[PDB]
Every structure is written in structure tokens, then in C-alpha cells.
Amino acid sequence: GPLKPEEHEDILNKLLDPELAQSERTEALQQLRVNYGSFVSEYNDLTKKMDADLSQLQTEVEEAVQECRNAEEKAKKAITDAAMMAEELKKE
Amino acid sequence: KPEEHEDILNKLLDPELAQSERTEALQQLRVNYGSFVSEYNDLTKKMDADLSQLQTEVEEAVQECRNAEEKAKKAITDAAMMAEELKKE
Amino acid sequence: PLKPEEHEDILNKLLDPELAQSERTEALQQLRVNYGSFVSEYNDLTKKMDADLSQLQTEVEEAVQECRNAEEKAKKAITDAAMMAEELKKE
Amino acid sequence: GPLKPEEHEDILNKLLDPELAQSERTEALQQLRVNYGSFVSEYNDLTKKMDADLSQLQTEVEEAVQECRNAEEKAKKAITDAAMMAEELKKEQ
């Protein structure tokens, strides 16, 4: 997978030799180009996935929030009906 | 009747009381008592039904709190699920 | 409390003009005790129910407040999740 | 690692030169060495913040769960109180 630090350092070390064969130089540069493009791509795939994850969590917690509003509304109806029952008994 | 009920009982104490005036006094206690027992039974029936309805309506709010728990627990499990999903890659 | 049929027997007993004064006074005292106690039971029943309805309102209002506190904690997680997305945009 | 893929490509194209002076070849590889170490640390901190964010959100939502259970039990006791009131009204009869 992605080049580890020590494995990445070995490539940079052999690229330091000016008399390195061109076939080996292009091969090492290709490894850096493929590894850097794959690592950048993986970084953007996690940034996008986390942003969508945080957005999905906000929508799911909001449905629990709205359910708390239903609890307050129904409980307040029992309060209103209890006061209505009190006024109803004093009318008679 | 509040105070006139004692006036009717005081008038019926007279053994001289005319039978027409005695029957009218006893019938006044007859209609008033039947009206009072009905209002009492209507009261004990109304408050028993009122408290039963309040239990049902407050229970509706209890269930909404349960639904809120279930929605929020789903967000907790989903958040934990998208945590192990990030470590898989 | 005196039942409607049992109350009718006392009224029919008082209808008798030949009834002795000892039983007539005792039958009227039977109606005076029954009525004053019946009115007292009715008023005390109304007073107790009004205190019950007022107490239930207070107890449910406190349950509403806990629902509000639960709502504000859940909304805080939404607000914190939103700033977590903005703080990951520090690129 | 703020090096965009086009900036990284120019360094690779520079290292392709066989006649490249040793000082320029050493400097170019030093840029990649520092940039790669800064990009791995940024990747590790990202995976660290993502796990800590999802853990803190679970904790805050669980705090909201415990209060919903508390509000549930408060209202359930009001139901029992309402039932105990109806039982006490019937006892006095």
C-alpha cells in the first residue's frame, strides 16, 4: 500500500546518486508519483466521508430533538386538560 | 338547599302539620335528595374518568420520550459504526 | 350515606300523623345528620380533587423541563457536530 | 503536506535530469523528505481527530439519552400519582 516512512526514505536515498542508471531513476520517480497520488486521493476520500458522516449525524440527532418536542407538546396537553378539568368542576 | 333544608325539617317536627303541607314538605325532600345523589354520583364518575384520561395522555408523552431515546441511540450506534468504517480503510 | 330507597322509608315514616314524637324527632335528626354529612363529603371531595389536578399539573411541568433539558443537550450535539465539520475544513 | 500534485510533479521532473547538480538534487529530495513527513503527520492527526469527534458526539448524545429516560420516569410517576389519587378518592366513599 502506501509507502512507509522507512520505505519512502530508501527511495529518496537511491535518488541522491547522480550516476544512478536512468532506468532505475525513472522507476523510483514513478513509485513516488503513484504513491503520492494515491496518498492524496486517500486523504480526500476520508475528508469527504467524515464531512458526510457529520452531516448525517446532525440529521439523525435532529429527529430525536423533534421527538422531544412531541413529548413536550403531549405533556403540555395533559397540563392544559388538567386545568380544563379543574375549571369544569367549579362551573358545576 | 343550604339553610332552607333545616327549615323544612323544623316544620315537619310539628305533629299538628296539615297533611297537604306535610306531603309537600316530604316531597321537597324527595326531589332534592334524588337530585343530590345524582350530582354526587356524577361527580365521583367525572373525577374517576378525568384521572384515567390524564394517565393516558401523560403516557403518550412517555412514549415520545422513548421514541426520542430510540432516535438518539440510533445516532450513537451509527456514529460508532462510521468510526470502525473509517478504521477499515 | 343514606340510599335513595332507605331515604324514602324515613319520609314515609314521617308521613304518618300518628307517629310518636320520639320517633319523629329521631327521624328528623336522622335527616339532619345525613344531609349535613352528605354536603360535607361533597365539598371535601371537590377540594381534594382540585388539589389533585393542581398537583398533577406541577409534576408534569417538571417532566416537561427535563424534556427541554434533554432537547438542549441533543441540540448541543448538533451544534458541536457542525463546528466539527467546519474545523475539519482548516485546509 | 501542502504540496499539491502539480507542485510534487515539478520536483519529480527536476529529479529526472541526469545532469542535475548534486546541490539541486539534494535540495529537491530534501523538499520531498520534509513534505512527506508533514503529510503523514497530517494524515495521522486527521484519523485521530475523526475518532475523537465521533467519540465526543456519542458522549453528548448519550447524555441526552439519559435525560430522556429521566423525563420518562418523572412522567411515569405522575401517572402512578394520578392512579393513587383515584384510589384515595374511592376509599373515602
GROMACS .gro file of C-alpha atoms in nm:
model
  365
    1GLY     CA    1   0.000   0.000   0.000
    2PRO     CA    2   0.121   0.349   0.089
    3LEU     CA    3   0.497   0.380   0.127
    4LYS     CA    4   0.602   0.368   0.490
    5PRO     CA    5   0.848   0.632   0.618
    6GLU     CA    6   1.147   0.396   0.607
    7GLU     CA    7   1.047   0.259   0.267
    8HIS     CA    8   0.999   0.616   0.142
    9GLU     CA    9   1.343   0.714   0.273
   10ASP     CA   10   1.511   0.427   0.085
   11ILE     CA   11   1.377   0.563  -0.246
   12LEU     CA   12   1.494   0.917  -0.169
   13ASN     CA   13   1.835   0.777  -0.074
   14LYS     CA   14   1.898   0.595  -0.403
   15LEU     CA   15   1.774   0.901  -0.595
   16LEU     CA   16   2.058   1.102  -0.439
   17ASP     CA   17   2.319   0.927  -0.655
   18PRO     CA   18   2.375   1.130  -0.975
   19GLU     CA   19   2.534   0.831  -1.153
   20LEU     CA   20   2.225   0.616  -1.093
   21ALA     CA   21   2.105   0.437  -1.405
   22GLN     CA   22   1.825   0.624  -1.579
   23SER     CA   23   1.607   0.312  -1.592
   24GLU     CA   24   1.634   0.288  -1.213
   25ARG     CA   25   1.584   0.664  -1.171
   26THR     CA   26   1.260   0.672  -1.371
   27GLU     CA   27   1.137   0.362  -1.187
   28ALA     CA   28   1.195   0.527  -0.849
   29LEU     CA   29   1.031   0.853  -0.960
   30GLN     CA   30   0.731   0.653  -1.085
   31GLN     CA   31   0.693   0.496  -0.740
   32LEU     CA   32   0.687   0.842  -0.583
   33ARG     CA   33   0.434   0.971  -0.836
   34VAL     CA   34   0.199   0.675  -0.786
   35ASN     CA   35   0.236   0.673  -0.407
   36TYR     CA   36   0.184   1.048  -0.367
   37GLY     CA   37  -0.124   1.048  -0.590
   38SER     CA   38  -0.271   0.753  -0.402
   39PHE     CA   39  -0.198   0.910  -0.063
   40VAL     CA   40  -0.351   1.244  -0.165
   41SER     CA   41  -0.656   1.062  -0.301
   42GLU     CA   42  -0.698   0.863   0.021
   43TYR     CA   43  -0.674   1.187   0.222
   44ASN     CA   44  -0.957   1.345   0.022
   45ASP     CA   45  -1.173   1.032   0.048
   46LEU     CA   46  -1.161   1.047   0.429
   47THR     CA   47  -1.220   1.423   0.442
   48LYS     CA   48  -1.527   1.379   0.221
   49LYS     CA   49  -1.653   1.075   0.413
   50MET     CA   50  -1.615   1.246   0.752
   51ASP     CA   51  -1.797   1.558   0.631
   52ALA     CA   52  -2.085   1.340   0.510
   53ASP     CA   53  -2.075   1.143   0.836
   54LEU     CA   54  -2.103   1.457   1.049
   55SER     CA   55  -2.386   1.581   0.827
   56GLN     CA   56  -2.574   1.252   0.863
   57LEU     CA   57  -2.533   1.257   1.242
   58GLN     CA   58  -2.686   1.606   1.262
   59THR     CA   59  -2.995   1.488   1.073
   60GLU     CA   60  -3.032   1.178   1.292
   61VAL     CA   61  -2.997   1.368   1.621
   62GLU     CA   62  -3.247   1.627   1.494
   63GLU     CA   63  -3.510   1.354   1.465
   64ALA     CA   64  -3.452   1.284   1.834
   65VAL     CA   65  -3.483   1.658   1.901
   66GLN     CA   66  -3.816   1.675   1.719
   67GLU     CA   67  -3.932   1.374   1.919
   68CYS     CA   68  -3.853   1.566   2.239
   69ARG     CA   69  -4.077   1.843   2.104
   70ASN     CA   70  -4.360   1.591   2.061
   71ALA     CA   71  -4.308   1.480   2.421
   72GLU     CA   72  -4.335   1.838   2.548
   73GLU     CA   73  -4.642   1.909   2.334
   74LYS     CA   74  -4.830   1.600   2.453
   75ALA     CA   75  -4.728   1.661   2.815
   76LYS     CA   76  -4.843   2.022   2.788
   77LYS     CA   77  -5.177   1.900   2.652
   78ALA     CA   78  -5.221   1.691   2.967
   79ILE     CA   79  -5.143   2.005   3.168
   80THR     CA   80  -5.399   2.209   2.974
   81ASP     CA   81  -5.661   1.934   3.001
   82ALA     CA   82  -5.596   1.906   3.376
   83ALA     CA   83  -5.662   2.278   3.418
   84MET     CA   84  -5.970   2.247   3.196
   85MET     CA   85  -6.094   1.968   3.424
   86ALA     CA   86  -6.044   2.198   3.724
   87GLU     CA   87  -6.246   2.481   3.569
   88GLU     CA   88  -6.510   2.228   3.459
   89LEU     CA   89  -6.570   2.114   3.818
   90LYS     CA   90  -6.603   2.469   3.954
   91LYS     CA   91  -6.867   2.556   3.694
   92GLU     CA   92  -7.096   2.290   3.843
   93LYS     CA   93  -8.064   2.362   4.952
   94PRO     CA   94  -7.837   2.506   5.222
   95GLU     CA   95  -8.037   2.661   5.507
   96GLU     CA   96  -8.398   2.601   5.398
   97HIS     CA   97  -8.337   2.227   5.446
   98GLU     CA   98  -8.328   2.295   5.820
   99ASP     CA   99  -8.648   2.499   5.782
  100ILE     CA  100  -8.826   2.204   5.619
  101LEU     CA  101  -8.707   1.967   5.893
  102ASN     CA  102  -8.821   2.217   6.157
  103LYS     CA  103  -9.168   2.246   6.002
  104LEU     CA  104  -9.215   1.867   5.982
  105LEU     CA  105  -9.145   1.846   6.356
  106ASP     CA  106  -9.496   1.977   6.418
  107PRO     CA  107  -9.737   1.686   6.474
  108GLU     CA  108 -10.018   1.933   6.401
  109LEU     CA  109  -9.890   1.992   6.042
  110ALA     CA  110 -10.165   1.975   5.781
  111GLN     CA  111 -10.138   1.662   5.568
  112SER     CA  112 -10.122   1.863   5.245
  113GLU     CA  113  -9.845   2.082   5.386
  114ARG     CA  114  -9.671   1.774   5.529
  115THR     CA  115  -9.678   1.589   5.195
  116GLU     CA  116  -9.542   1.897   5.016
  117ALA     CA  117  -9.256   1.918   5.267
  118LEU     CA  118  -9.171   1.549   5.230
  119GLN     CA  119  -9.185   1.570   4.850
  120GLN     CA  120  -8.947   1.867   4.861
  121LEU     CA  121  -8.701   1.645   5.048
  122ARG     CA  122  -8.766   1.369   4.792
  123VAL     CA  123  -8.677   1.569   4.480
  124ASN     CA  124  -8.384   1.743   4.649
  125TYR     CA  125  -8.228   1.418   4.773
  126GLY     CA  126  -8.257   1.241   4.437
  127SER     CA  127  -8.103   1.547   4.274
  128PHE     CA  128  -7.820   1.549   4.529
  129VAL     CA  129  -7.731   1.180   4.498
  130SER     CA  130  -7.723   1.213   4.118
  131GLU     CA  131  -7.488   1.512   4.135
  132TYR     CA  132  -7.268   1.320   4.380
  133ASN     CA  133  -7.254   1.009   4.161
  134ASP     CA  134  -7.189   1.229   3.858
  135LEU     CA  135  -6.901   1.390   4.048
  136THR     CA  136  -6.738   1.062   4.155
  137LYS     CA  137  -6.777   0.940   3.796
  138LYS     CA  138  -6.631   1.254   3.638
  139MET     CA  139  -6.317   1.271   3.853
  140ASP     CA  140  -6.252   0.898   3.811
  141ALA     CA  141  -6.271   0.939   3.433
  142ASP     CA  142  -6.066   1.260   3.445
  143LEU     CA  143  -5.776   1.094   3.627
  144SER     CA  144  -5.793   0.797   3.389
  145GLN     CA  145  -5.769   1.028   3.087
  146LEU     CA  146  -5.473   1.215   3.238
  147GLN     CA  147  -5.286   0.886   3.282
  148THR     CA  148  -5.343   0.802   2.915
  149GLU     CA  149  -5.236   1.147   2.794
  150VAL     CA  150  -4.924   1.158   3.011
  151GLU     CA  151  -4.838   0.808   2.889
  152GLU     CA  152  -4.842   0.948   2.535
  153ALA     CA  153  -4.565   1.187   2.641
  154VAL     CA  154  -4.376   0.895   2.798
  155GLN     CA  155  -4.375   0.708   2.466
  156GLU     CA  156  -4.247   1.016   2.282
  157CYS     CA  157  -3.951   1.018   2.522
  158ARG     CA  158  -3.897   0.651   2.433
  159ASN     CA  159  -3.908   0.739   2.063
  160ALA     CA  160  -3.655   1.015   2.133
  161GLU     CA  161  -3.430   0.763   2.308
  162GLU     CA  162  -3.453   0.526   2.011
  163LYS     CA  163  -3.371   0.801   1.759
  164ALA     CA  164  -3.074   0.920   1.965
  165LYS     CA  165  -2.944   0.569   2.034
  166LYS     CA  166  -2.951   0.510   1.657
  167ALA     CA  167  -2.730   0.816   1.612
  168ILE     CA  168  -2.497   0.677   1.880
  169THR     CA  169  -2.471   0.338   1.711
  170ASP     CA  170  -2.440   0.497   1.366
  171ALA     CA  171  -2.161   0.724   1.493
  172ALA     CA  172  -1.981   0.421   1.635
  173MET     CA  173  -2.043   0.233   1.309
  174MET     CA  174  -1.893   0.507   1.092
  175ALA     CA  175  -1.595   0.506   1.331
  176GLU     CA  176  -1.497   0.144   1.267
  177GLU     CA  177  -1.574   0.203   0.898
  178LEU     CA  178  -1.305   0.472   0.888
  179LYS     CA  179  -1.051   0.240   1.053
  180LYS     CA  180  -1.122  -0.033   0.795
  181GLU     CA  181  -0.967   0.193   0.528
  182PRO     CA  182  -7.461   0.770   5.305
  183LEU     CA  183  -7.837   0.714   5.305
  184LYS     CA  184  -7.952   0.532   4.992
  185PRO     CA  185  -8.248   0.671   4.793
  186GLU     CA  186  -8.468   0.376   4.895
  187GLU     CA  187  -8.358   0.397   5.259
  188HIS     CA  188  -8.424   0.772   5.250
  189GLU     CA  189  -8.774   0.705   5.115
  190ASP     CA  190  -8.857   0.485   5.414
  191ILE     CA  191  -8.785   0.771   5.655
  192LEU     CA  192  -9.002   1.009   5.451
  193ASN     CA  193  -9.289   0.759   5.451
  194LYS     CA  194  -9.242   0.718   5.827
  195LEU     CA  195  -9.278   1.095   5.874
  196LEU     CA  196  -9.594   1.095   5.661
  197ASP     CA  197  -9.777   0.917   5.945
  198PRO     CA  198  -9.951   1.188   6.153
  199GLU     CA  199  -9.996   0.941   6.441
  200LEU     CA  200  -9.620   0.887   6.469
  201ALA     CA  201  -9.489   0.936   6.821
  202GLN     CA  202  -9.279   1.244   6.890
  203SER     CA  203  -8.982   1.031   7.000
  204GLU     CA  204  -8.961   0.866   6.658
  205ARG     CA  205  -9.050   1.183   6.466
  206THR     CA  206  -8.767   1.380   6.628
  207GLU     CA  207  -8.528   1.088   6.582
  208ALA     CA  208  -8.625   1.055   6.215
  209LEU     CA  209  -8.569   1.426   6.151
  210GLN     CA  210  -8.235   1.411   6.333
  211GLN     CA  211  -8.163   1.118   6.102
  212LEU     CA  212  -8.221   1.350   5.805
  213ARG     CA  213  -8.027   1.639   5.961
  214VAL     CA  214  -7.721   1.423   6.026
  215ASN     CA  215  -7.742   1.257   5.684
  216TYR     CA  216  -7.772   1.585   5.493
  217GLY     CA  217  -7.502   1.784   5.672
  218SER     CA  218  -7.260   1.493   5.636
  219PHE     CA  219  -7.351   1.450   5.268
  220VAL     CA  220  -7.282   1.816   5.191
  221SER     CA  221  -6.952   1.796   5.380
  222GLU     CA  222  -6.846   1.488   5.182
  223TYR     CA  223  -6.930   1.668   4.857
  224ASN     CA  224  -6.731   1.981   4.944
  225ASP     CA  225  -6.433   1.782   5.072
  226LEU     CA  226  -6.445   1.570   4.756
  227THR     CA  227  -6.435   1.883   4.539
  228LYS     CA  228  -6.149   2.029   4.743
  229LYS     CA  229  -5.940   1.711   4.727
  230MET     CA  230  -5.987   1.673   4.351
  231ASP     CA  231  -5.885   2.035   4.287
  232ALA     CA  232  -5.564   1.979   4.483
  233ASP     CA  233  -5.504   1.660   4.284
  234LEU     CA  234  -5.545   1.833   3.947
  235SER     CA  235  -5.317   2.118   4.057
  236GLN     CA  236  -5.051   1.877   4.184
  237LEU     CA  237  -5.057   1.674   3.861
  238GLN     CA  238  -5.002   1.992   3.660
  239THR     CA  239  -4.691   2.074   3.864
  240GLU     CA  240  -4.547   1.723   3.833
  241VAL     CA  241  -4.597   1.712   3.455
  242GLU     CA  242  -4.444   2.060   3.414
  243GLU     CA  243  -4.129   1.928   3.582
  244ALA     CA  244  -4.131   1.638   3.336
  245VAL     CA  245  -4.157   1.895   3.055
  246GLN     CA  246  -3.849   2.075   3.190
  247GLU     CA  247  -3.647   1.753   3.185
  248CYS     CA  248  -3.759   1.701   2.824
  249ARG     CA  249  -3.637   2.054   2.748
  250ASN     CA  250  -3.303   1.986   2.917
  251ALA     CA  251  -3.279   1.666   2.711
  252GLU     CA  252  -3.364   1.862   2.396
  253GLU     CA  253  -3.096   2.124   2.464
  254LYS     CA  254  -2.831   1.855   2.517
  255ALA     CA  255  -2.922   1.689   2.187
  256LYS     CA  256  -2.921   2.023   2.004
  257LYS     CA  257  -2.578   2.089   2.156
  258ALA     CA  258  -2.451   1.773   1.987
  259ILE     CA  259  -2.588   1.904   1.657
  260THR     CA  260  -2.417   2.241   1.702
  261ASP     CA  261  -2.094   2.070   1.808
  262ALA     CA  262  -2.110   1.831   1.512
  263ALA     CA  263  -2.149   2.128   1.276
  264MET     CA  264  -1.843   2.307   1.413
  265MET     CA  265  -1.652   1.978   1.392
  266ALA     CA  266  -1.718   1.985   1.017
  267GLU     CA  267  -1.607   2.349   0.992
  268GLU     CA  268  -1.295   2.277   1.198
  269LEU     CA  269  -1.203   1.995   0.959
  270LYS     CA  270  -1.220   2.248   0.673
  271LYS     CA  271  -0.897   2.407   0.804
  272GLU     CA  272  -0.720   2.304   0.484
  273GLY     CA  273   0.197   1.816   0.338
  274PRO     CA  274   0.068   2.119   0.148
  275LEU     CA  275   0.240   2.017  -0.179
  276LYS     CA  276  -0.032   1.987  -0.441
  277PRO     CA  277   0.011   1.710  -0.702
  278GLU     CA  278   0.126   1.965  -0.960
  279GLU     CA  279   0.397   2.102  -0.729
  280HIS     CA  280   0.507   1.748  -0.646
  281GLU     CA  281   0.527   1.671  -1.019
  282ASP     CA  282   0.766   1.961  -1.088
  283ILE     CA  283   1.009   1.825  -0.828
  284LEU     CA  284   0.997   1.480  -0.987
  285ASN     CA  285   1.059   1.633  -1.330
  286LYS     CA  286   1.358   1.816  -1.181
  287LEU     CA  287   1.498   1.492  -1.038
  288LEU     CA  288   1.458   1.328  -1.381
  289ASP     CA  289   1.751   1.537  -1.510
  290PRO     CA  290   2.068   1.321  -1.516
  291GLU     CA  291   2.293   1.630  -1.537
  292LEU     CA  292   2.123   1.787  -1.233
  293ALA     CA  293   2.381   1.933  -0.996
  294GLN     CA  294   2.429   1.749  -0.668
  295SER     CA  295   2.323   2.057  -0.471
  296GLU     CA  296   1.995   2.081  -0.664
  297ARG     CA  297   1.938   1.705  -0.645
  298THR     CA  298   1.999   1.709  -0.269
  299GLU     CA  299   1.769   2.008  -0.216
  300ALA     CA  300   1.486   1.857  -0.422
  301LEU     CA  301   1.494   1.527  -0.231
  302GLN     CA  302   1.505   1.726   0.094
  303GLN     CA  303   1.181   1.901  -0.006
  304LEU     CA  304   1.013   1.564  -0.066
  305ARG     CA  305   1.151   1.431   0.264
  306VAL     CA  306   1.009   1.721   0.467
  307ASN     CA  307   0.682   1.729   0.272
  308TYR     CA  308   0.618   1.355   0.308
  309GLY     CA  309   0.682   1.368   0.682
  310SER     CA  310   0.443   1.662   0.713
  311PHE     CA  311   0.180   1.479   0.506
  312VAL     CA  312   0.197   1.160   0.713
  313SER     CA  313   0.159   1.361   1.035
  314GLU     CA  314  -0.140   1.546   0.890
  315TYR     CA  315  -0.295   1.213   0.790
  316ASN     CA  316  -0.238   1.064   1.136
  317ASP     CA  317  -0.387   1.370   1.308
  318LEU     CA  318  -0.689   1.357   1.076
  319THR     CA  319  -0.760   0.994   1.164
  320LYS     CA  320  -0.704   1.093   1.528
  321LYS     CA  321  -0.949   1.385   1.516
  322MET     CA  322  -1.212   1.181   1.331
  323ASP     CA  323  -1.211   0.914   1.602
  324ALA     CA  324  -1.219   1.175   1.880
  325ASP     CA  325  -1.503   1.369   1.715
  326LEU     CA  326  -1.721   1.060   1.673
  327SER     CA  327  -1.643   0.961   2.033
  328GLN     CA  328  -1.732   1.302   2.176
  329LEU     CA  329  -2.059   1.307   1.981
  330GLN     CA  330  -2.155   0.967   2.122
  331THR     CA  331  -2.092   1.101   2.473
  332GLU     CA  332  -2.300   1.417   2.426
  333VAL     CA  333  -2.592   1.229   2.268
  334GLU     CA  334  -2.581   0.966   2.543
  335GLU     CA  335  -2.616   1.249   2.795
  336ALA     CA  336  -2.934   1.348   2.611
  337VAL     CA  337  -3.048   0.984   2.620
  338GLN     CA  338  -3.011   0.962   2.998
  339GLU     CA  339  -3.225   1.274   3.050
  340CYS     CA  340  -3.499   1.143   2.820
  341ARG     CA  341  -3.506   0.834   3.042
  342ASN     CA  342  -3.518   1.065   3.344
  343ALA     CA  343  -3.805   1.265   3.195
  344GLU     CA  344  -3.981   0.937   3.113
  345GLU     CA  345  -3.957   0.819   3.474
  346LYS     CA  346  -4.079   1.155   3.609
  347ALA     CA  347  -4.393   1.139   3.396
  348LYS     CA  348  -4.448   0.771   3.481
  349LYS     CA  349  -4.451   0.865   3.849
  350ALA     CA  350  -4.711   1.132   3.773
  351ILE     CA  351  -4.922   0.856   3.617
  352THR     CA  352  -4.891   0.645   3.933
  353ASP     CA  353  -4.972   0.951   4.143
  354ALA     CA  354  -5.283   1.010   3.932
  355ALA     CA  355  -5.380   0.646   3.985
  356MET     CA  356  -5.313   0.673   4.358
  357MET     CA  357  -5.531   0.984   4.374
  358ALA     CA  358  -5.820   0.799   4.209
  359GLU     CA  359  -5.774   0.515   4.458
  360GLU     CA  360  -5.782   0.757   4.752
  361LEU     CA  361  -6.099   0.926   4.626
  362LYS     CA  362  -6.274   0.588   4.609
  363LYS     CA  363  -6.159   0.493   4.960
  364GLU     CA  364  -6.335   0.795   5.113
  365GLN     CA  365  -6.667   0.674   4.967
   0.00000   0.00000   0.00000
